[PDB]
Design a protein around this nucleic acid. Structure first.
Ligand SMILES: [Mg+2]
Ligand code: NA
Ligand code: NA
Length: 327
DNA sequence: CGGCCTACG
DNA sequence: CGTAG
DNA sequence: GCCG
């Protein structure tokens, strides 16, 4: 009844099993901190299955037959239903390792492998990292410098202000170029931790060289605190606020218009949705999907898509609008 | 047994 | 390695 | 951890 791939089922933003999914996602995150991407994926997938259910799970029997629920994920739900807590989840939550790995990997520029090395070296707090700055990349220095602001929710009012200044810079750099809001905000989220924009031009080839021109124009307006030929720019903007400013993470992506449906699909997410869609494409349909195109490795050809709907159709999938891709 | 998404900076 | 969805 |  419940399809096994997340791209085969609608997942709305608001759902009925948040307590259960959040517990499984703690175990997924902890699996990642220990270097087990496979266990992370299973727990992510199991959490996502619960997000797609039409009603609250109140009895363990409601799990029978569900994909990605085996002995371990079922026991977690069982304990939560019977007792309101899962001992394993609580042990993880309270552990110094989990808390510190979460603290460090939430820094922009720091992933699991870097966080784990620092943990093994005895580091535990952000001030510990600040006390040893030669051990930081430029990206990490920027992540730590702006960490307070980057932990503040980005609101819709911020998104609208950012879209205006990005549209102004893009228009100065290339008349006729367009700016599309992607990421979680396109899926209907009201808050986020960053803002994602996709930039193109209707005439194929005119977007060559656009992103450096856009960045130069934003920097000369004093809008850029941090950035790295290129097509993805991971920025920190100086966003004006009444009497002051705050740092905000902004991603700017350029795509030629021939690739725009693929980039729009990829950058709209969710992350799990897109991993599942790429897995489905290759494993079930024998086609290779990324944010540039959909490749048939037998014919050695690329699928010409005019819309996201075209891509779903070519993959034999029922179309899902962005607000149902919240896997 | 062995895969688990697939890119760019 | 980091980043992204 | 789950499954093809
Ligand atoms: Mg985002
Ligand atoms: Na990080
Ligand atoms: Na982003």
């Amino acid at each position: 009844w419940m399809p096994a791939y997340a791209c085969q089922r609608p997942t709305p933003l608001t759902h009925h099993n948040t307590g259960l999914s959040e517990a499984l996602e703690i175990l997924a995150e902890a699996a990642g901190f220990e270097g087990s991407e496979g266990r992370l994926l299973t727990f992510c997938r199991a959490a996502s299955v619960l997000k797609a259910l039409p009603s609250p799970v109140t009895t363990l029997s409601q799990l029978q037959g569900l994909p990605h629920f085996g002995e371990h994920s079922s026991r977690v739900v069982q304990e939560l239903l019977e007792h309101g807590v899962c001992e394993e989840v609580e042990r993880v939550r309270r552990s110094e390792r989990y808390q510190t790995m979460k603290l460090f990997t939430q820094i922009f520029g720091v992933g699991v492998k870097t966080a784990d090395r620092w943990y093994r070296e005895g580091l535990r707090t952000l001030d510990d990292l600040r006390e040893q700055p030669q051990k930081l990349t430029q990206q990490q220095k920027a992540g730590l410098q702006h960490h307070q602001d980057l932990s503040t929710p980005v609101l819709r009012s911020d998104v609208d202000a950012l879209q205006q200044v990005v549209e102004e810079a893009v228009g100065q750099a290339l008349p006729g170029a367009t700016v599309t809001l992607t990421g979680g905000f396109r899926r209907g989220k009201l808050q986020g931790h960053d803002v994602d924009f996709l930039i193109t031009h209707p005439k194929e080839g005119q977007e060559a060289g656009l992103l450096p021109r856009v960045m130069c124009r934003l920097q000369d307006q004093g809008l850029i605190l941090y950035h790295q030929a290129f097509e993805r720019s991971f920025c920190i903007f100086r966003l004006p606020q009444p009497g002051s400013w705050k740092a905000v993470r902004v991603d700017l992506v350029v795509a030629p218009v021939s690739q725009f449906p693929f980039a729009l699909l990829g950058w709209t997410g969710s992350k799990l949705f897109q991993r599942e869609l790429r897995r489905f494409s290759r494993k079930e349909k024998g086609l290779w999907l990324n944010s540039h195109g959909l490749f048939d490795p037998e014919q050695k050809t690329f699928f010409q898509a005019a819309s996201e709907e075209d891509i779903f159709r070519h993959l034999g999938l029922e179309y899902l609008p962005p607000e149902q891709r919240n896997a």
